[PDB]
Amino acid sequence: ELYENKPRRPYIL
């Protein structure tokens, strides 16, 4: 998506 959220790229990585 154009708007990147945090539960897609959370600090879990």
Torsion sign, CA atoms 6, 8, 12, 13? negative
How far is the C-alpha of 13 from the C-alpha of 2, rounded, in Å? 20
Is the Cα dihedral 6, 8, 11, 12 positive or negative? positive
DSSP H/E element including 6: none
Find the angle CA(8)-CA(12)-CA(10) to the nearest 5 degrees.
Answer: 35
- Please count the CA atoms within 13 angstroms of the CA of 10 that sit on its side-chain side: 3
What distance in Å separates the CA atoms of residue 11 and residue 13, rounded to the nearest whole number? Answer: 5
CA distance 13 to 6: 11
For residues 10 and 13, give the distance between their C-alpha atoms in angstroms, rounded to a whole number.
7
Give the Cα separation of 2 and 12 in Å (integer).
Answer: 21
